[PDB]
Amino acid sequence: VNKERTFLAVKPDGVARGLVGEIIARYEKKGFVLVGLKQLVPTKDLAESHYAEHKERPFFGGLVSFITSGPVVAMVFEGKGVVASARLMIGVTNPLASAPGSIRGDFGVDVGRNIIGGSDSVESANREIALWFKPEELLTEVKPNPNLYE
Amino acid sequence: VNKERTFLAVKPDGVARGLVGEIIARYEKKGFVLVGLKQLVPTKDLAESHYAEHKERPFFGGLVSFITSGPVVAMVFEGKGVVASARLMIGVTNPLASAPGSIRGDFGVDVGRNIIGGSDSVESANREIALWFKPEELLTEVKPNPNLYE
Amino acid sequence: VNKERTFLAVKPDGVARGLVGEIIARYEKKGFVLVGLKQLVPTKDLAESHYAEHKERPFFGGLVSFITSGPVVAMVFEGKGVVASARLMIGVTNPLASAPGSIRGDFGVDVGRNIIGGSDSVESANREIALWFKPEELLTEVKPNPNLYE
Amino acid sequence: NKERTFLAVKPDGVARGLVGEIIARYEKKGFVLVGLKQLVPTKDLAESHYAEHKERPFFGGLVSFITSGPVVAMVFEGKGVVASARLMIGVTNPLASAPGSIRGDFGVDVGRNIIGGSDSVESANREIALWFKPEELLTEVKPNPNLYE
Amino acid sequence: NKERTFLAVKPDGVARGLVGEIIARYEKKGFVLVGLKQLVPTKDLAESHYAEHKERPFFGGLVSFITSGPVVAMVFEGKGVVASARLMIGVTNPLASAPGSIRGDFGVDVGRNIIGGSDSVESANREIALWFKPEELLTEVKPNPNLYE
Amino acid sequence: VNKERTFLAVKPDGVARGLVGEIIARYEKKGFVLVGLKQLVPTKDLAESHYAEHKERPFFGGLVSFITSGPVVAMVFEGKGVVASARLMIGVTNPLASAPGSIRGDFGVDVGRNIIGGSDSVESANREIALWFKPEELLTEVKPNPNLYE
Ligand SMILES: C[C@H](Cn1cnc2c(N)ncnc21)OCP(=O)(O)OP(=O)(O)OP(=O)(O)O
Ligand SMILES: C[C@H](Cn1cnc2c(N)ncnc21)OCP(=O)(O)OP(=O)(O)O
Ligand SMILES: C[C@H](Cn1cnc2c(N)ncnc21)OCP(=O)(O)OP(=O)(O)O
Ligand SMILES: C[C@H](Cn1cnc2c(N)ncnc21)OCP(=O)(O)OP(=O)(O)O
Numbered sequence: 063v064n065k066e067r068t069f070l071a072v073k074p075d076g077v078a079r080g081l082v083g084e085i086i087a088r089y090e091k092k093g094f095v096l097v098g099l100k101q102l103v104p105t106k107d108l109a110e111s112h113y114a115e116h117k118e119r120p121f122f123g124g125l126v127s128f129i130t131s132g133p134v135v136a137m138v139f140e141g142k143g144v145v146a147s148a149r150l151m152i153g154v155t156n157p158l159a160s161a162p163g164s165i166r167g168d169f170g171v172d173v174g175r176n177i178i179g180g181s182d183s184v185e186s187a188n189r190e191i192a193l194w195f196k197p198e199e200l201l202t203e204v205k206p207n208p209n210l211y212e
Numbered sequence: 213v214n215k216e217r218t219f220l221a222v223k224p225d226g227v228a229r230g231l232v233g234e235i236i237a238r239y240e241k242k243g244f245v246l247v248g249l250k251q252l253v254p255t256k257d258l259a260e261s262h263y264a265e266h267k268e269r270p271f272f273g274g275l276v277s278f279i280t281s282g283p284v285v286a287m288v289f290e291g292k293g294v295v296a297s298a299r300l301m302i303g304v305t306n307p308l309a310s311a312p313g314s315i316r317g318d319f320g321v322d323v324g325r326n327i328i329g330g331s332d333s334v335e336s337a338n339r340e341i342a343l344w345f346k347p348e349e350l351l352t353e354v355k356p357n358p359n360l361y362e
Numbered sequence: 363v364n365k366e367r368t369f370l371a372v373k374p375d376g377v378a379r380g381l382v383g384e385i386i387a388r389y390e391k392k393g394f395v396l397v398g399l400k401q402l403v404p405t406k407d408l409a410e411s412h413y414a415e416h417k418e419r420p421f422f423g424g425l426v427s428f429i430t431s432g433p434v435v436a437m438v439f440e441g442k443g444v445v446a447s448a449r450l451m452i453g454v455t456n457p458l459a460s461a462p463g464s465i466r467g468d469f470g471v472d473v474g475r476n477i478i479g480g481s482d483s484v485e486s487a488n489r490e491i492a493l494w495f496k497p498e499e500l501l502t503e504v505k506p507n508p509n510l511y512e
Numbered sequence: 513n514k515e516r517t518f519l520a521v522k523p524d525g526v527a528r529g530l531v532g533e534i535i536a537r538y539e540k541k542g543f544v545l546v547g548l549k550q551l552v553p554t555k556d557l558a559e560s561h562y563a564e565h566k567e568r569p570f571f572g573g574l575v576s577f578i579t580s581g582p583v584v585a586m587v588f589e590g591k592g593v594v595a596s597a598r599l600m601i602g603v604t605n606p607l608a609s610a611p612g613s614i615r616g617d618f619g620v621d622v623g624r625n626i627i628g629g630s631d632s633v634e635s636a637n638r639e640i641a642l643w644f645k646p647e648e649l650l651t652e653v654k655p656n657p658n659l660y661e
Numbered sequence: 662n663k664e665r666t667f668l669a670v671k672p673d674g675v676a677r678g679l680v681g682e683i684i685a686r687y688e689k690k691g692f693v694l695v696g697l698k699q700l701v702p703t704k705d706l707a708e709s710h711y712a713e714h715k716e717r718p719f720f721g722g723l724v725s726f727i728t729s730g731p732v733v734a735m736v737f738e739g740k741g742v743v744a745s746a747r748l749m750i751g752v753t754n755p756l757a758s759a760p761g762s763i764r765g766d767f768g769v770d771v772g773r774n775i776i777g778g779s780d781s782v783e784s785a786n787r788e789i790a791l792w793f794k795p796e797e798l799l800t801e802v803k804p805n806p807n808l809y810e
Numbered sequence: 811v812n813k814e815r816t817f818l819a820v821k822p823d824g825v826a827r828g829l830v831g832e833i834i835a836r837y838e839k840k841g842f843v844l845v846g847l848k849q850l851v852p853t854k855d856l857a858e859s860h861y862a863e864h865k866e867r868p869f870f871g872g873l874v875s876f877i878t879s880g881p882v883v884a885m886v887f888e889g890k891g892v893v894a895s896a897r898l899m900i901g902v903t904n905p906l907a908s909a910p911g912s913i914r915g916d917f918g919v920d921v922g923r924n925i926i927g928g929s930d931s932v933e934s935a936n937r938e939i940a941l942w943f944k945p946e947e948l949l950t951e952v953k954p955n956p957n958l959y960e
């Protein structure tokens with residue numbers, strides 16, 4: 063449906079490099095609606111829950127340590143196929159292999175400093191949204207631009 | 213071969229969302245020359261002729277109704293391989309599947325509100341140009357830049 | 363009223379330099395609505411009528427010769443105080459004295475190649491619009507955008 | 513270098529998709545984002561924020577509009593950020609705002625002015641305390657040697 | 662239309678990745694690049710560059726900073742390019758520079774004001790001679806009919 | 811591996827069309843560090859050495875003649891995988907087949923006027939850097955943004 067939602071986190075590197083506005087603008091221009099937005103410094107608990115699927119992996123510690131190393135801009139966007147579209151707009155895991163035009167393709171070089179990370183699926187998105195945002199922090203009335211949907 | 217021409221129409225949704233300038237700029241930056249331009253509200257007969265290839269399709273009535281629902285900005289651009297190039301610059305049928313960097317990839321989310329449409333072939337381009345424009349509305353003297361062509 | 367209109371002409375230099383889209387986008391982003399648009403090569407009669415106030419000035423011939431020397435993109439924009447606003451967005455007569463941020467301030471260096479010219483008053487706008495466009499080429503209804511106007 | 517100001521992207525700015533454009537302008541300028549959140553203001557929050565205009569005829573409509581939809585509240589930090597942020601926005605009448613400024617580039621109606629910033633340090637501190645909780649604001653920052661001497 | 666000015670994107674401008682942004686602004690304006698190179702300025706070059714301030718206490722600071730890292734030196738040609746380039750940059754204090762100007766859009770501190778241009782034709786000729794060898798400057802340009810009448 | 815370097819040349823057409831800043835900005839935004847930069851008019855000897863691999867090609871003369879026909883902006887960028895990344899950011903040989911988002915995809919239409927050319931390998935990059943720049947023209951002290959590499 064056109065009410066699908068995804069969670070996007072502009073990580074510490076993205077925030078430190080002043081790419082917050084650039085990124086938000088790309089999603090606004092696309093037609094997706096911002097239903098949740100806030101800057102915070104993630105706690106270790108939040109970080110470990112966010113990357114829970116990788117808890118047994120060697121790089122787990124580094125992922126958690128980095129996303130908690132500084133301010134992060136957390137956001138939720140709503141729109142048709144937003145989860146898959148947001149991932150396409152970001153690029154692939156490795157910024158160097160991402161095509162120009164994509165966020166990582168235009169601004170990143172390292173996998174561990176890949177600027178932003180979005181939900182990999184609807185299931186993960188619903189899980190992440192509930193983890194990072196309280197219900198009261200999410201819009202309940204969403205009406206995009208009627209020129210966007212048939 | 214550098215005199216090839218194609219027909220492009222910023223549809224009602226593209227105009228309503230204020231994307232006319234953005235789109236024209238992309239083609240200008242590319243090196244293509246504007247040889248025809250005008251804003252108009254398509255009539256039903258023009259729309260039905262324009263979309264004649266889908267006259268039997270179930271979504272035909274919808275295509276016609278929408279393209280005639282508001283102002284459209286019709287354009288004709290000239291340049292080497294402009295027909296196929298213009299299509300590549302627009303993206304693919306489904307905006308959600310279009311790569312970032314393309315017009316639809318950057319601004320669209322629904323197939324029925326795909327922002328802009330270009331001729332799919334030289335054959336179609338010549339037909340569409342004659343259908344939407346009068347001879348006197350098209351430049352006869354062009355010759356772009358020596359910086360663009362060998 | 364919110365239905366005030368002004369006439370803007372991207373002159374041959376602006377068109378040749380590929381600034382048409384850039385210019386249209388600036389006015390679209392501002393909130394003004396395009397109600398008339400077309401590219402044409404002005405006739406001497408049209409040019410002389412357009413610059414009638416300067417009929418007895420030494421530079422009259424030059425203004426006329428230049429605006430008819432190549433394609434021009436004529437447009438009409440509608441919105442509250444659009445006449446004075448469009449002039450402000452363009453800059454002052456001399457591009458070198460125009461502040462960065464304005465069209466001439468950002469793109470021009472010569473008075474005779476000042477890219478674009480807008481109506482200097484509501485009276486001139488109405489005169490110019492009727493001169494460059496036929497009634498059938500102008501949108502009749504626009505309906506105020508709730509996000510732009512009270 | 514620790515001065516802070518409160519900026520609110522109004523419902524019209526949010527609805528027109530100008531949030532990113534605006535944040536980018538302040539990031540590019542060199543100011544640091546120390547507070548950020550989207551919310552739909554309540555009547556009380558709106559009236560307190562715009563208390564200085566409470567006696568004016570348009571106050572009712574002003575309050576009704578800012579509470580009509582989502583607003584993106586922000587706090588930016590940097591030397592002279594209060595006056596600088598105002599200069600970047602333009603003047604009260606968007607039509608009189610010079611191109612290059614936010615209102616100059618995007619607005620046409622005084623009642624749909626896109627964004628509003630604190631007019632003084634005193635007002636900024638009041639507004640910041642009104643819209644944000646202490647824990648929602650950064651306490652770090654770390655001076656950037658490329659921005660300040 | 663042969664007038665020329667010297668522009669130096671200082672270490673802060675280079676470190677902040679604004680070299681392309683700045684060059685693009687002058688290219689779009691219609692001015693022609695007739696000299697360009699990145700270098701790390703030496704003390705003797707810097708002291709001559711800021712000679713008008715040699716008796717002032719901040720002379721040492723201006724010299725130390727412009728020689729602290731990579732600088733992109735450029736020479737642009739065009740009608741009234743000296744005064745125009747200054748207007749495009751803004752005023753000495755970036756906080757007081759209007760949005761739309763380089764310093765107005767990107768700077769916050771006087772000592773980190775990103776770029777500096779010649780203040781007069783006399784200074785431009787003097788500075789161009791100090792920073793560039795004749796062989797590093799274009800001799801063939803040819804006025805663009807779309808920019809000049 | 812983060813010290814890898816590549817040679818990029820904005821050819822006469824790219825310079826003449828005013829794309830130098832646009833191009834440099836793209837590489838700056840990506841995170842790569844500018845370690846060498848200068849505008850010059852290549853000599854025949856430099857050109858023939860640069861295109862040595864095509865000495866027996868029928869188009870060799872044309873490549874040499876064009877790159878020496880006007881000012882060129884030569885540059886060297888440093889960063890992880892910069893050689894392959896720079897090529898990807900430029901696009902493919904034929905600008906018409908280059909994807910929107912890439913330099914050639916956004917600005918070119920002719921193979922012979924492809925705007926910019928980058929080293930095709932580390933081997934070629936080191937050869938080209940030594941050919942176009944003296945060691946003293948290249949930075950030895952490099953400090954990329956601290957948020958770019960893990
Ligand atoms: C009152 C002002 C703009 N405004 C908003 N609505 C109106 C209206 N109907 N008539 C006149 N002015 C109006 O918005 C408040 P604000 O949003 O704070 O903008 P400002 O730039 O801070 O302006 P001020 O210093 O006066 O607070
Ligand atoms: C696990 C993934 C990539 N990754 C990030 N760091 C590492 C590492 N050290 N080893 C292997 N993989 C690594 O990072 C999480 P993420 O940055 O979210 O990438 P995604 O957007 O999910 O593709
Ligand atoms: C038939 C085509 C896309 N299309 C494909 N299927 C549909 C549908 N169900 N509703 C609306 N449009 C649809 O629309 C005409 P067009 O707008 O020209 O798109 P194109 O550039 O040709 O891909
Ligand atoms: C008369 C004015 C400027 N002008 C343009 N060319 C000349 C010239 N040769 N001598 C003196 N003035 C000149 O041009 C008309 P215009 O380009 O419309 O400027 P405006 O937007 O009306 O300020």
Ligand SMILES: C[C@H](Cn1cnc2c(N)ncnc21)OCP(=O)(O)OP(=O)(O)O
Pocket residue numbers: 714719722723752753771772774776777778
């Ligand atoms: C002297 C001027 C500003 N300035 C720069 N640093 C200082 C300082 N510490 N005290 C007083 N003035 C200072 O810097 C030279 P510049 O950066 O070239 O400014 P300009 O573009 O010439 O206006």
Ligand SMILES: C[C@H](Cn1cnc2c(N)ncnc21)OCP(=O)(O)OP(=O)(O)O
Pocket residue numbers: 864869872873902903921922923924926927928
């Ligand atoms: C041989 C290749 C493209 N080319 C292919 N054929 C030609 C031709 N006839 N004229 C000019 N260039 C031609 O040009 C070298 P280059 O411009 O470096 O492209 P590259 O980035 O190496 O792919």
Ligand SMILES: [Mg+2]
Pocket residue numbers: 179180182
């Ligand atoms: Mg992930």
Ligand SMILES: [Mg+2]
Pocket residue numbers: 329330
């Ligand atoms: Mg079609």
Ligand SMILES: [Mg+2]
Pocket residue numbers: 479480
């Ligand atoms: Mg005039």
Ligand SMILES: [Mg+2]
Pocket residue numbers: 628629631
């Ligand atoms: Mg106020």
Ligand SMILES: [Mg+2]
Pocket residue numbers: 777778
């Ligand atoms: Mg100075």
Ligand SMILES: [Mg+2]
Pocket residue numbers: 927928
């Ligand atoms: Mg090559």
